[PDB]
Amino acid sequence: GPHMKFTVEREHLLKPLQQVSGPLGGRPTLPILGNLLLQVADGTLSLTGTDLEMEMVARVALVQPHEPGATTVPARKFFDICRGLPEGAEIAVQLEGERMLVRSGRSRFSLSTLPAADFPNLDDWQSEVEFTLPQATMKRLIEATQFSMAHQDVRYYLNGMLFETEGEELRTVATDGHRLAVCSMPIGQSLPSHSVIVPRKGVIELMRMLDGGDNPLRVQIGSNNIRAHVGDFIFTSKLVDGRFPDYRRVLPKNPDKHLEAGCDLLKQAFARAAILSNEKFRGVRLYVSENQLKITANNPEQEEAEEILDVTYSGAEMEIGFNVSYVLDVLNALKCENVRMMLTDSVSSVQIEDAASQSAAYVVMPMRL
Amino acid sequence: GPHMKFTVEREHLLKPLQQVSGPLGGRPTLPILGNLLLQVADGTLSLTGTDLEMEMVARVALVQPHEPGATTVPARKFFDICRGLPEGAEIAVQLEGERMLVRSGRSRFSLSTLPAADFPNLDDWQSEVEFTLPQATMKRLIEATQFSMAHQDVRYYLNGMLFETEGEELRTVATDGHRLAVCSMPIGQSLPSHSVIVPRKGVIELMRMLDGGDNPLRVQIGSNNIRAHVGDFIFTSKLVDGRFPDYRRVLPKNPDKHLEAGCDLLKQAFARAAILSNEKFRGVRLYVSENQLKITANNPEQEEAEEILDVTYSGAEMEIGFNVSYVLDVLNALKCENVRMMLTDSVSSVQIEDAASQSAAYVVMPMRL
Amino acid sequence: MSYQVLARKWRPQTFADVVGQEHVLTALANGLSLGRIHHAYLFSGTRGVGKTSIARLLAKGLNCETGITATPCGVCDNCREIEQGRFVDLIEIDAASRTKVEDTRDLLDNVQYAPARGRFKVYLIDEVHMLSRHSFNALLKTLEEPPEHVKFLLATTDPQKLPVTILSRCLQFHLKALDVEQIRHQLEHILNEEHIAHEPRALQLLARAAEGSLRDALSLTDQAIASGDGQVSTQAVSAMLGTLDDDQALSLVEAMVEANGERVMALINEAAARGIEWEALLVEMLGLLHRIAMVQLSPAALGNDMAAIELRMRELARTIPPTDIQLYYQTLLIGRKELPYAPDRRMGVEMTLLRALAFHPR
Amino acid sequence: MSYQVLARKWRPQTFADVVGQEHVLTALANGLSLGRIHHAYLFSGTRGVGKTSIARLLAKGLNCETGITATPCGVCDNCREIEQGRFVDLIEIDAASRTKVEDTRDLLDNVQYAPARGRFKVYLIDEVHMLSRHSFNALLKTLEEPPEHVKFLLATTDPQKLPVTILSRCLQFHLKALDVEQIRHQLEHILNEEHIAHEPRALQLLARAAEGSLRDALSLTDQAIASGDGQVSTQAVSAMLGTLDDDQALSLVEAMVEANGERVMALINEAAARGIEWEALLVEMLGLLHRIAMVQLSPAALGNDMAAIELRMRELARTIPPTDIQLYYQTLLIGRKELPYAPDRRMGVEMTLLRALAFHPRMPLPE
Amino acid sequence: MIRLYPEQLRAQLNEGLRAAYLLLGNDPLLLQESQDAVRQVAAAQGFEEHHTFSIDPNTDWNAIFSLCQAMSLFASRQTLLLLLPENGPNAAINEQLLTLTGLLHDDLLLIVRGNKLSKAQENAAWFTALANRSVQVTCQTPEQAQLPRWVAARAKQLNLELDDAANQVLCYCYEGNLLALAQALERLSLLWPDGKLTLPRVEQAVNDAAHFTPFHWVDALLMGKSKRALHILQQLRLEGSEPVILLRTLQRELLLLVNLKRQSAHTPLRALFDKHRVWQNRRGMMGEALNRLSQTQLRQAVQLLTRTELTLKQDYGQSVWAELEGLSLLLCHKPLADVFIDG
DNA sequence: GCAGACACTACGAGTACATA
DNA sequence: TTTTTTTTATGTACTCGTAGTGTCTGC
Ligand SMILES: Nc1ncnc2c1ncn2[C@@H]1O[C@H](COP(=O)(O)OP(=O)(O)O)[C@@H](O)[C@H]1O
Ligand SMILES: Nc1ncnc2c1ncn2[C@@H]1O[C@H](COP(=O)(O)OP(=O)(O)O)[C@@H](O)[C@H]1O
Ligand code: BEF
Ligand code: BEF
Numbered sequence A, B: 001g002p003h004m005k006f007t008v009e010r011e012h013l014l015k016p017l018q019q020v021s022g023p024l025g026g027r028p029t030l031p032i033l034g035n036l037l038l039q040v041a042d043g044t045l046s047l048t049g050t051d052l053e054m055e056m057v058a059r060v061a062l063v064q065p066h067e068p069g070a071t072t073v074p075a076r077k078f079f080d081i082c083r084g085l086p087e088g089a090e091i092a093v094q095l096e097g098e099r100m101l102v103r104s105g106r107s108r109f110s111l112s113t114l115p116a117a118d119f120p121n122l123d124d125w126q127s128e129v130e131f132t133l134p135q136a137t138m139k140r141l142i143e144a145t146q147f148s149m150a151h152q153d154v155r156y157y158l159n160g161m162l163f164e165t166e167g168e169e170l171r172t173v174a175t176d177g178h179r180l181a182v183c184s185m186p187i188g189q190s191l192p193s194h195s196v197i198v199p200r201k202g203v204i205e206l207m208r209m210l211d212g213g214d215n216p217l218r219v220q221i222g223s224n225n226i227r228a229h230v231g232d233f234i235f236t237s238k239l240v241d242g243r244f245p246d247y248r249r250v251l252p253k254n255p256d257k258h259l260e261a262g263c264d265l266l267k268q269a270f271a272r273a274a275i276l277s278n279e280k281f282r283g284v285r286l287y288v289s290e291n292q293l294k295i296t297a298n299n300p301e302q303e304e305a306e307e308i309l310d311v312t313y314s315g316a317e318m319e320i321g322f323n324v325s326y327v328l329d330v331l332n333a334l335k336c337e338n339v340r341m342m343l344t345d346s347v348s349s350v351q352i353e354d355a356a357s358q359s360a361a362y363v364v365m366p367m368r369l
Numbered sequence C: 001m002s003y004q005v006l007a008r009k010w011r012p013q014t015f016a017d018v019v020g021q022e023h024v025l026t027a028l029a030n031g032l033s034l035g036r037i038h039h040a041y042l043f044s045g046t047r048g049v050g051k052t053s054i055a056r057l058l059a060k061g062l063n064c065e066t067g068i069t070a071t072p073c074g075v076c077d078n079c080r081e082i083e084q085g086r087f088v089d090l091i092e093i094d095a096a097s098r099t100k101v102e103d104t105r106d107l108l109d110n111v112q113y114a115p116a117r118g119r120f121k122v123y124l125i126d127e128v129h130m131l132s133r134h135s136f137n138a139l140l141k142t143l144e145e146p147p148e149h150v151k152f153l154l155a156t157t158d159p160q161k162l163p164v165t166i167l168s169r170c171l172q173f174h175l176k177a178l179d180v181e182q183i184r185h186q187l188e189h190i191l192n193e194e195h196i197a198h199e200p201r202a203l204q205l206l207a208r209a210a211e212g213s214l215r216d217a218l219s220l221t222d223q224a225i226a227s228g229d230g231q232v233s234t235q236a237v238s239a240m241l242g243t244l245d246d247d248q249a250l251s252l253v254e255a256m257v258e259a260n261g262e263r264v265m266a267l268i269n270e271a272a273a274r275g276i277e278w279e280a281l282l283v284e285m286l287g288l289l290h291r292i293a294m295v296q297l298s299p300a301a302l303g304n305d306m307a308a309i310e311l312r313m314r315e316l317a318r319t320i321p322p323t324d325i326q327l328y329y330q331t332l333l334i335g336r337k338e339l340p341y342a343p344d345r346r347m348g349v350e351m352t353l354l355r356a357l358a359f360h361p362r
Numbered sequence D: 001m002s003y004q005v006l007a008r009k010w011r012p013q014t015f016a017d018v019v020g021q022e023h024v025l026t027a028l029a030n031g032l033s034l035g036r037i038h039h040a041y042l043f044s045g046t047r048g049v050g051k052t053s054i055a056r057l058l059a060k061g062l063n064c065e066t067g068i069t070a071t072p073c074g075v076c077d078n079c080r081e082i083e084q085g086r087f088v089d090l091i092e093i094d095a096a097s098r099t100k101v102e103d104t105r106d107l108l109d110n111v112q113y114a115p116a117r118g119r120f121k122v123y124l125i126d127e128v129h130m131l132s133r134h135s136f137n138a139l140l141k142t143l144e145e146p147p148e149h150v151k152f153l154l155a156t157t158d159p160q161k162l163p164v165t166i167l168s169r170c171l172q173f174h175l176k177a178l179d180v181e182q183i184r185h186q187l188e189h190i191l192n193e194e195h196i197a198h199e200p201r202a203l204q205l206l207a208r209a210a211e212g213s214l215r216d217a218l219s220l221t222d223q224a225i226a227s228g229d230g231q232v233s234t235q236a237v238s239a240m241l242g243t244l245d246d247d248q249a250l251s252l253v254e255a256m257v258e259a260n261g262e263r264v265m266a267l268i269n270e271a272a273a274r275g276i277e278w279e280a281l282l283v284e285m286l287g288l289l290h291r292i293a294m295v296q297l298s299p300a301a302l303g304n305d306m307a308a309i310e311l312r313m314r315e316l317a318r319t320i321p322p323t324d325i326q327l328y329y330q331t332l333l334i335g336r337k338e339l340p341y342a343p344d345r346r347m348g349v350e351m352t353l354l355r356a357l358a359f360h361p362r363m364p365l366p367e
Numbered sequence E: 001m002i003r004l005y006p007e008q009l010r011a012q013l014n015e016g017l018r019a020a021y022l023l024l025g026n027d028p029l030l031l032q033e034s035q036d037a038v039r040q041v042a043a044a045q046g047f048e049e050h051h052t053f054s055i056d057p058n059t060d061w062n063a064i065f066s067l068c069q070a071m072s073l074f075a076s077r078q079t080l081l082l083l084l085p086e087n088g089p090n091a092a093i094n095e096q097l098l099t100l101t102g103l104l105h106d107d108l109l110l111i112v113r114g115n116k117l118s119k120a121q122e123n124a125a126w127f128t129a130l131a132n133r134s135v136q137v138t139c140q141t142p143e144q145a146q147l148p149r150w151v152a153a154r155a156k157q158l159n160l161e162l163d164d165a166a167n168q169v170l171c172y173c174y175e176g177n178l179l180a181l182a183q184a185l186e187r188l189s190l191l192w193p194d195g196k197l198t199l200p201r202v203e204q205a206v207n208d209a210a211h212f213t214p215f216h217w218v219d220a221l222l223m224g225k226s227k228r229a230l231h232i233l234q235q236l237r238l239e240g241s242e243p244v245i246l247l248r249t250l251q252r253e254l255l256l257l258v259n260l261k262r263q264s265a266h267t268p269l270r271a272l273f274d275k276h277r278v279w280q281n282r283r284g285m286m287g288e289a290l291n292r293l294s295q296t297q298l299r300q301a302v303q304l305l306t307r308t309e310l311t312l313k314q315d316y317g318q319s320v321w322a323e324l325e326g327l328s329l330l331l332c333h334k335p336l337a338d339v340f341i342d343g
Numbered sequence F: 001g002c003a004g005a006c007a008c009t010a011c012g013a014g015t016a017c018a019t020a
Numbered sequence G: 001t002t003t004t005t006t007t008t009a010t011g012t013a014c015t016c017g018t019a020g021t022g023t024c025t026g027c
């Protein structure tokens, strides 16, 4: 049988295992899908973890004696044994017969395995566009728009994120039929325009695998897949066939009324009013008057919540409604100093932006009470 | 009724409100049961909550004008509305028309209330035996055996733990029929002989009570009611009849076989061994040789796990098989530097103790013969 | 060496290798050759009659490289790949194992993705009558507006367990239970395609005892080969069936009516060699006599439940006057009434049959 | 050394030591010899006729060191653990203790993992008729196309509970209840191997007492050994069973058909002195009447265990009409029906005998 | 409100969509076709957000979430579907649907599907609120005498010819099951592109899958249709209907028969039917039965039914189905059952 | 330090079904 | 058209919703 010799450090191995053993859990579609493909070749090691729609490959350098091989191992067990060994412990791994022996100086573990031949090697392809972006930019792009994606909508193409690379900049769009989150960031280079839908699990994995470091992120987007490289992590994912609707027409074309307020102040006022809102469907009413904002919340057991805050406002008078969860989420994700609100009327969309920046925009509908 | 006019500073309200809202939670059996009563008499405001087998009383001082009166408010809503307010902001609460108006700055909220006569009280008992003990003292006293008590079992009243007072010493015991934990320690007062069973929920609340190494906690023990005083915090609970088995008989009287080991090394070895143990029958077998302890674990998928640790032992091989969750829990609780295992026979139970302290001891029954 | 079981290695791979059931094969062939393909086919049958095999064959035909055709080529990489377990577009879901909605969502969300290789992403959901209600709701939501690139193939044993709304959106093909002649013909082909000698009487017995299913017939064929020293002889199959016979009722009532005391004794001894509750045996014998007396009144009394023993039963109904049947039922009823108080249940049922045998003949 | 129960000490350890069940043993050995190994076996039959033992022997034959051998070659390494029951790969599943589907799912998840040491990971599912319907449906597909390195051995008492879609895809081996001669010979072997004296009539009674099983027969033999001073004697067996041997009840029926009440009551008194259950006397007499009916209908119906009285049997077979036999049987059957309600069980038996005497169609009591 | 038939639903949707559609009835096929037509026409007129939302008493009630909120992405009109319980809404569900209809967007389309609702649910506040704008369409299974016309219409829909024998065979095989009937017509269309369906083809392309309710069995017994009665009993055995329901459904009419036969010798049937509160469709039925069966057969049937019920609820036996077949033989037809099936 | 964020485990209920 | 619908005492699973607990991380 295959030899597949391993002799590695724990610290050089803990992080890639924690990254590749993320989505694996529960009961998978197939038993092999619940196993990491460990493949040692040349002087390097590939750890492959897949869910029939994504594939994360982690590369680990080898300097100790080793022999080539490939076998699939339970993921949770391997990660737990790797994390359970003492700090700095050496790990030796040998495939004997149809079992795998993991040895440290005073411990020997045996593990069931599966042949690497039966592992569903994901199909390869050719990227239609390249891309290079600093990690912090992608971090902000995901953090600005991940929360507004549709959860399990019937349309089955809103359950994702729209990547729109145009001219020089990149845009991320998310929606749920009642909210819209759009974020635009520069990249520094002119790029071909592409519209792509990334599934929610792909977006979550991309968020997790950022590592918060400084090395650039490489992206290769093809016809039906995307691939991302950070250090020694290569994550590929499929795409959604649906066509993401045009975000441009959603935003209020003619915002009649401008107002500005403290981000933290408005957020905490909304939070305080949210307690006394109906659990059947949580929402509040905004009364916008001359430099004044009033928040009114009602609950069917005759519970009333009232708030008044001094805001900057340019308009006559307004009465509108708002699902308090949506506004609370958008203010929480804003993470800025002051918020600017664009209002048109009680039956059209409302725009939310930074008072001093325009990279991120949000659109929300009033809720009729 | 009357008009409250209670002005309370947030700093003097948030922590006691959290303390009294601790025991309550989840969906109550009947309405009103989930609620709290605030009563102001001669400048002192008491927040009291109950589960009709527990009660919380918190006393705070008032300097602003008021009137003596008692009113009930839903707990979670008041706790969430008092929090999140600007720091240092006063809260003015006032009763009109069977509802409570709470004001802070320009923030107004209205809450449905119930008559104070609708808030039941608990029993009364006099001549309670008094205790004056340090907080962290009883904290670690229970913590050594908090895991030990069995939850949701019919046998005896294992949903709780026993306090025994003898001479000048307080001892605490818990068990499940397979594992037992004792912790005895001298208090420093002339005390009678008593043996009582405090319920598990009362134990959790008692742990929640402890805060600071300041003024010592005062216990008032009886037969069917228990009380705890921590500063201006008063807690009361209802006890459980019956009595646990004689812990003295449970402890082996022939610890002929001795073993000395390191706490952290043994804990890590057991944690590593538990990975490949049976998910339901988390049992490992132990081979004890001179200055050597070997642990073997199996599971239905095989995946044998072996480990070996250096100890201080002299004798024959015992091959004691027992559960891993129990030994892992006790080794987590010890947090000492050295651990003494004490073995009697391959059928007998095993004893676990601190090597450098006799205050706490444990016993665990074996698994298979 | 590795002698693969006859239930697996002889699974059909083309529509021409499927026995009988032309009312479904022809319909599917016409649908595939023409443009009319429904969005969800639901296959039904009885106990191994060709549901999963036909569903697999349909999935093979839908994604063949030569195109959507009644006959898959069997040569292209897709035909070879679906032939084995491994393939990407064809998703074989053991619905009986992943009943929970949590597992169903993880595989019904793949519809939004494009098929990797073939034209259609085909979901072969086997044993669909087992899903949970919420999982059924999820699958119905998928089927309400299914993408044009996904075809659903559902195979089950009891269609009526399915909720009506999901069934309303599926074209249901009910597979007829195979006839004795078709069973015997396919069994002869299977034996001759391999190196197993046989005698036609043995195959006739196998077909009759197979209860109209090819899996039962093939399982019995493998058992016969094993106990037959590599040759299927009549005596071996007959002795095995005697060890496996369960219809002691009809044979015993035939003997009792014909008044063969020795045959009744032998059949009681055989029914004692097998652990049989005597109360159950006697009560179902009463039921058989009841059905006989009913058939005396109208030929339509014998419904579709007892089609396997129709002929014999009809004969027993035709050749026996009703008064004797009434008397036999009366004596059997009174014997069963006093049965628990007899020496032994075997003992008491024996003498009850003797009482019923002493009348009319002898 | 030591004294363990016969039911566990004398479990067969090879196909040579399994008595009876010739068809199943022959089929299994022949199939193993030919190499044709089906992937699902279902052993049905009455309790205690060896389905679990045969299944474990099949596991031995499959996992033996020398290869796929019909006869397990004595005791090899891979068979030692089977004998000790601690085998790595023979997965014993007390299906009655794992009826939930959330456990059959765990069983099916790890089915593909290669066996640790043996050629096959034989899943022995004891009492397969106890799994919940969901677990059945779960294991359907894994039975239809199992991996090449796993086999299922299912043992159950009544196959009818199982869904027919499971009976379809598995071999059905049915183990008939063993004959009286088989049980008696096996018991003679067991008592000889234990260096214990025994009586042939005692062992014949042991064979008749157990309904075609063996572990029941072994249990009753162990109880006999307990009742005796470590010896199986005829008196001890008669005491433990409560039977009448084959003579006293025959004297009763002979006197009753002779319409001699005096001897009937005299033997009733003697049986009372014997300290025996009265319903036992009634059931023995009913059984004797039925045996008379059987020999009257079928000329050759007596087994060897009654040969000691066979001659007298034929006497009644040539002397009494079948109608009178039916009359006596029904009279004593109603007597059995009424006995628990009589003022005294002895009183009730006396009344039943006197009722059979008064309605004697040949020599009735004078009026 | 408008009360409508499935044939005219096309015209009603063509003239203009109303606020809400209540499609109700006992059959699956007509309900499904009506719902599909409504959904397709709404999609043609600009309805894209389609929601299926079962009402059944469970942990599922959040429909209000989909109506109070305007769609940010597009001004897409929404369609909400409700699957009423097997017996209709209860009081709590009545008031919950009243709250649901208390507020409805003009661009929101409401679809409700379920079985027929009696006056108890018809006079509830929810239905009265819906009484103004909503259109209710009734889809009921045609009777055994009405099936051939419907099958002929369906054949003309698919451009098929069946003559008369094939129509009778299909009506008998799929009696009371229109879904399987339409599926079988589609299957026959697929089998023969010629479209000229005849007996030597529909005979082997058909199934026996049929549906029934105890009223059909009782009426079959009353008319004396022996083969139909036994067919219904066999189909109900396969369906697994509770035997007790059959017992009670027969017992009601059998007690009525016993009483009417008792009163017949002294009072004319015209007054007796009025006094005994008999439905107008059953009068002739009863007449035939009364003029066919004497009080001896009625008493024997009552004895048989009594033995059946007692053995059902005391001995826990399984002989119920054969026993009801025996009663069918003993009821209007050929009374023999001599002790054998007469206790 | 601390929620809070899952993550998981347990429990109730709605429902199906078995047996007698 | 039409409205029409039944035994039960006890036990065994299965599946989803929702609370209670642990822990673990980037807060
Ligand atoms: N129409 C058929 N032609 C040939 N073999 C068949 C046919 N139907 C059933 N079989 C046999 O039965 C075995 C199992 O068949 P399968 O199609 O899985 O039945 P099911 O409908 O119950 O899933 C097949 O391997 C094949 O040998
Ligand atoms: N055919 C047999 N040959 C020899 N002993 C048997 C046989 N059947 C049963 N026994 C005895 O019964 C004991 C248990 O038998 P077992 O096979 O467990 O029966 P079961 O089919 O009920 O599980 C065995 O140890 C053996 O002594
Ligand atoms: F695989 Be079949 F439905 F028996
Ligand atoms: F497995 Be047997 F019934 F003792």
Ligand SMILES: [Mg+2]
Pocket: C051, C052, C053, C126, C155
């Ligand atoms: Mg199948």
Ligand SMILES: [Mg+2]
Pocket: D051, D052, D126, D155
């Ligand atoms: Mg057994």
Ligand SMILES: [Zn+2]
Pocket: C064, C065, C066, C072, C073, C074, C075, C076, C077, C078, C079
């Ligand atoms: Zn092909």
Ligand SMILES: [Zn+2]
Pocket: D060, D064, D065, D072, D073, D074, D075, D076, D077, D078, D079
């Ligand atoms: Zn061996």
